[PDB]
């Protein structure tokens, strides 16, 4: 029950600032180095910052140097990341991880051996907005739903209230030049069942408190 719990994520306008917290428990926090690592949507792991077990020194990735500050409080078992002058390219899931750095087991034991769960930061000017849901009308037929112009992530889509799961492909959303997201969800069904079977995509966008049920018809 060693655990790192991130918090502080959310939507933030470019140029504005945000603070992440990472609560540690179940181990001796003051004997571990700590890292922030981030992962942009669809991208690999990118390293952000490190700080040593006693907050001695701190180092930063070049792309965040001068704008981010890593800190820690060992009497609160917590690690922080102060993020200022946020840019679009800063949008990611942010992870904290602990790193023994030879403090334990072996003098060469260096690595991020425990991670938090991640917290999403989204940098954007866009306003919260629920999606429009358009049908993709149909021995096998394809049908689907186009879930368009929403902000922010995410939406969830199901078919016939979760009843229909085979042949369902719900694609990763794409960010449009508008700043609004779009995704489609499709399903292949036997051509025979059209007219006999009803197909309804269920879309919900919790940040808009929007829920839409769209019948997809031939």
């Amino acid at each position: 029950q060693v655990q790192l719990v991130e918090s502080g994520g959310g939507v933030v306008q470019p140029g504005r600032s945000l603070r992440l917290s990472c609560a540690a428990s179940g181990f001796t926090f003051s004997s571990y180095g700590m890292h922030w690592v981030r992962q942009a949507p669809g991208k690999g792991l990118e390293w952000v910052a490190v700080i040593w077990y006693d907050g001695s020194n701190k180092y930063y990735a070049d792309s965040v140097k001068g704008r981010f500050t890593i800190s820690r409080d060992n009497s609160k078992n917590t690690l922080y990341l102060q993020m200022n002058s946020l840019r679009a390219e800063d949008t990611a899931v942010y992870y904290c991880a602990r790193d023994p750095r030879g403090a334990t087991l072996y003098y060469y034991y260096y690595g991020m051996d425990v991670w938090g769960q991640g917290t999403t930061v989204t940098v954007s000017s866009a306003s919260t907005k629920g999606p429009s849901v358009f049908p993709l009308a149909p021995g096998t037929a394809a049908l689907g739903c186009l879930v368009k112009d929403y902000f922010p992530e995410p939406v969830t889509v199901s078919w016939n209230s979760g009843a229909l799961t085979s042949g369902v492909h719900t694609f990763p959303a794409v960010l449009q030049s508008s700043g609004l997201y779009s995704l489609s969800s499709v399903v292949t069904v036997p051509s025979s069942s059209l007219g006999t079977q009803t197909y309804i995509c269920n879309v919900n966008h919790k940040p808009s408190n929007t829920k839409v049920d769209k019948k997809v018809e031939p």
Binding site: Q117, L146, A173, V174
Partner: protein, 213 residues
């Protein structure tokens, strides 16, 4: 700073296979290298540290070697739970840099995509915009190319693609391409065509419709 690279970018392997992937540093980093495993929508997990030491709790089929600028990670016998993305990371010098990752995916026979094209709905059109969708369904391998033509003229800059992860059941991928036009443009044209290129096809397949038929 030190630059990390990996190879290959992706590899296709089967359960029971001996998998070997490599990591390269832009300069010598001695043995100061970590390997990580990450699965979609979850936190990375330390596999190897100091280039060859196994992290506690990690199956012995994993191992690692190298020192200086060249490193390898080897899975002696791939198990279903090893299909993931793997990252190296140097801690020799700050800033600490990850490699781009190597995606270990599930090999299957070639499968050509099934192509469907969808006209924009009446409902969308009433609101001034037209989206035309082309679906490439249940193909393997992942490399596929979609192209749009409107009245045989070649589109560019008005489409976006999305691809699913490898399906768990059949290990195929699916691809969505969306061609976005103004309602006014959409109605100045007749034939809309999606042309698909993929290893499973002898020659490209074209799906089209005529506007209002």
């Amino acid at each position: 700073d030190i630059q990390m690279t990996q190879s290959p970018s992706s590899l296709s392997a089967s359960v029971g296979d001996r998998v070997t992937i490599t990591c390269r540093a832009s300069q010598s980093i001695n043995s100061y290298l970590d390997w990580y495993q990450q699965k979609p929508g979850k936190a990375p997990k330390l596999l190897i540290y100091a280039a060859s030491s196994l992290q506690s709790g990690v199956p012995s089929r994993f191992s690692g070697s190298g020192s200086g600028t060249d490193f390898t990670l080897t899975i002696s016998s791939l198990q279903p739970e090893d299909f993931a993305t793997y990252y190296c990371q140097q801690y020799y010098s700050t800033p600490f840099t990850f490699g781009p990752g190597t995606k270990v995916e599930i090999k299957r026979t070639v499968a050509a995509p099934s192509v469907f094209i969808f006209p924009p709905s009446d409902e969308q059109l009433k609101s001034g915009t037209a989206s035309v969708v082309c679906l490439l369904n249940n193909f393997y391998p992942r490399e596929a190319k979609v192209q749009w033509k409107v009245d045989n003229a070649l589109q560019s800059g008005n489409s976006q693609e999305s691809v699913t992860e490898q399906d768990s059941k059949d290990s195929t991928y699916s691809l969505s391409s969306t061609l976005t036009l103004s309602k006014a443009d959409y109605e100045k044209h007749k034939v809309y065509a999606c042309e698909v290129t993929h290893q499973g096809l002898s020659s490209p397949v074209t799906k089209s419709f005529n506007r209002g038929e």
